[model samples]
Target: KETAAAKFERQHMDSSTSAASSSNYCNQMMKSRNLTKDRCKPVNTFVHESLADVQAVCSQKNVACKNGQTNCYQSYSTMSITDCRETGSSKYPNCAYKTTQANKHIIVACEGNPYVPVHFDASV
Candidate 1:
């Protein structure tokens, strides 16, 4: 498991949002890092926590709501978020997701070299 300091360094030495800079970071750090898959692992815990946080946000909004139809993700309930976006694709990986009681929806975008936690900005 990477320590807070190491996570900080991996994120950024000069800024906190470096993790959001690109998708390459997610692909490299998250997928490449070979650590224990146990829930006690820091990375696994962090990923779970982050996605749960996003789910909390989504649960408050109705994911079934449509935004012009095709662009809408009405099935946030069935979707699984991932750390890395599809290769050559502009969409971010939403590997961890769940429908919440609030029914709110969020689209966490990570379409760059480094990936970071992006909260949902859609209005309920």
Candidate 2:
């Protein structure tokens, strides 16, 4: 069985594609990645950096998570990322998304052996 952390990497990590060419990125990825099954995922961010680089963030600058958790770290450098947001009128079985690309410092929650990124907390 795949762990949530592993699943997160499979769905949100895309080091191969460093840039988003079209606005339909989120629309396509959200559905194709199986994030739109039960309900629309309001927000999701995809990182376009090497897995090692992202894991290294666990020991980088410490920061508070959006939920006031103490298990978050911010990346040292700006990273390529795409933000997917569900549109207001989006409903189940028809999830719509808006894709936006940006270079920002990534914040993530790390845990477990070797301490890898578990949850993508947010991007700054």
Candidate 3:
């Protein structure tokens, strides 16, 4: 099934910037995206690159995945991104986040026939 890739996209991809605000974007987006339901996702990232761009990482040859698999790759160039980290004061249902905009290389794991991104390994 495509759930792996789909979930990855849901959790990481945000190519469109319409919903992006200067501050508190994480609080809004994180909750809206359902990452802050039963329990808040302590930390997360949103990539501003297009689907094609993210997918290109998989074709960049070899890299180690978070689990030490060779099916991952790191971005060749810095990219626009946002990191959402839950604040210490965050409560279970009231997950609060601190958003930090950045430019860095993202590493993700890919798989399947389409060879799309399936897991977010790390950001550098």
Candidate 4:
């Protein structure tokens, strides 16, 4: 089974991208990162910063989760991130995504020992 840390890295972390290049970024990364295996992920965010910096968000101020969960936290500083939204034309095994990069404070849900991010809540 994939650990929470590992899953967080898969779904959120993306320090390798030097620049956003084009909107096609998510179309490529969404698949390359194995997020498009069975069905398209409706919305996802990729943090374009170091893993340590991304992980540090868990220590920031508490915030209300989009789903009303109590474990979410919002980053104190704006961070580079790429938001991926599935296009209407996207289909299973043929996912298409629109990518938008921004610098914003991210919200994430944390859990478990040491309390690390388990879900990418939102970026604002």
User: What local lDDT does model 3 show for residue 78?
Assistant: 80
TM-score of 2: 0.93
The C-alpha stretches of model 4 lying farther than 4 A from their native spots are none
Model 1: CA > 4 A from native: 1-18, 21-23, 33-52, 65-83, 86-124
lDDT of 1: 0.30
**Model 3 poorest 10 in a row by lDDT:** 15-24
Which number leads on lDDT? 2
Order of candidate numbers by lDDT, starting with the best: 2, 4, 3, 1
Location of the lowest summed lDDT over 10 successive residues in candidate 2? 4-13
> TM-scores of all models?
0.24, 0.93, 0.92, 0.93
By TM-score rank, best first, the candidates go 4, 2, 3, 1
- CA lDDT of each prediction against the hidden true structure: 0.30, 0.88, 0.87, 0.87
Root-mean-square deviation of Cα positions for candidate 2 versus the true structure, in angstroms = 1.2
Candidate 3, superposed: residue stretches over 4 Å from native: 18-20
| Per-candidate clashes, comma-separated | 24, 0, 0, 0
**What is the total number of backbone clashes in candidate 1?**
24
lDDT of 1 by residue, 1-124 (tens): 7544344233322222222344344444443343222221222211222434443432332333333322222224423222332333322332221111222223432212233323222323
TM-score computed on alpha carbons, candidate 4: 0.93
Candidate 2 backbone collisions, by pair: none
RMSD in Å for all candidates: 14.7, 1.2, 1.8, 1.2
